[PDB]
């Protein structure tokens, strides 16, 4: 039984990462939201919450399903779903650096 | 020319909009359940 | 219906074929030169 | 002066890298091919040769230039760039799993 560490808690990261990972996408155009704040608090929590890159990916097509669906019913240029990809891969290898760094090396 | 001839199989597979992603999970998503 | 309506604001940036990627490198393809 | 780790090796590496890369993209689709070996080569040697996601990350845009680029001037459908996105997110992924894995953690 982890610190008091329940299968909600997780799934209450999830439910953050989740709204985050998309909050990020919503600000990767901003003017001027420090999308990094995003980027980060995912980033943190990704790591932090031992999320794997699963979810991140799983996550990830979810919410492009999303934006397709409405850019179909809306009839709205599908190209903007590049952003998610831009979104999507540089969030996996922003957190996968962070990965990269939290591994002490000798040398 | 150099001979890196990329080519891939171009006009190969019918991907739509989303067309497949990371729908592979990549057999990660396993980090949990009891 | 849930709440969270995900928008992103659809139909605002002009992206061609290879429409941006990667190029943003990341600043992390610095990892040796002298 | 690393053992005898000249800035070429690594440019040696590169160019393997380069090569098996894109050699896990022609194999993606491939009907027998062990992609896997072609991921599981670009993963070692990219965690090994210390490699950033940098440049798999531009390493993935130059070669999907060349597609694009091709699809164009030979009329191809270019929705067959969604392999490379396939390609590169699911390479990153798998690369990204391994250093997560090299991480010793107590518990």
Chains 1, 4 share one sequence.
Do not use: W
């Amino acid at each position: 039984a982890m610190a008091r560490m329940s299968p909600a808690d997780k799934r209450k990261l999830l439910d953050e990462l989740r709204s985050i990972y998309r909050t990020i996408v919503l600000e990767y155009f901003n003017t001027d939201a420090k999308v990094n704040e995003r980027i980060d608090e995912f980033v943190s929590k990704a790591f932090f919450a031992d999320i794997s890159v699963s979810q991140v990916l799983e996550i990830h097509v979810e919410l492009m399903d999303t934006f397709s669906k409405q850019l179909k019913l809306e009839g709205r240029s599908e190209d903007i779903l590049l952003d998610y990809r831009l979104t999507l891969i540089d969030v996996i290898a922003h957190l996968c650096e962070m990965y990269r760094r939290s591994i002490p090396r000798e040398v | 020319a150099m001979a890196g001839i990329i080519s891939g199989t171009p006009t190969r597979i019918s991907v739509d909009e989303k067309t497949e992603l990371a729908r592979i999970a990549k057999g990660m998503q396993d980090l949990e359940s009891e």
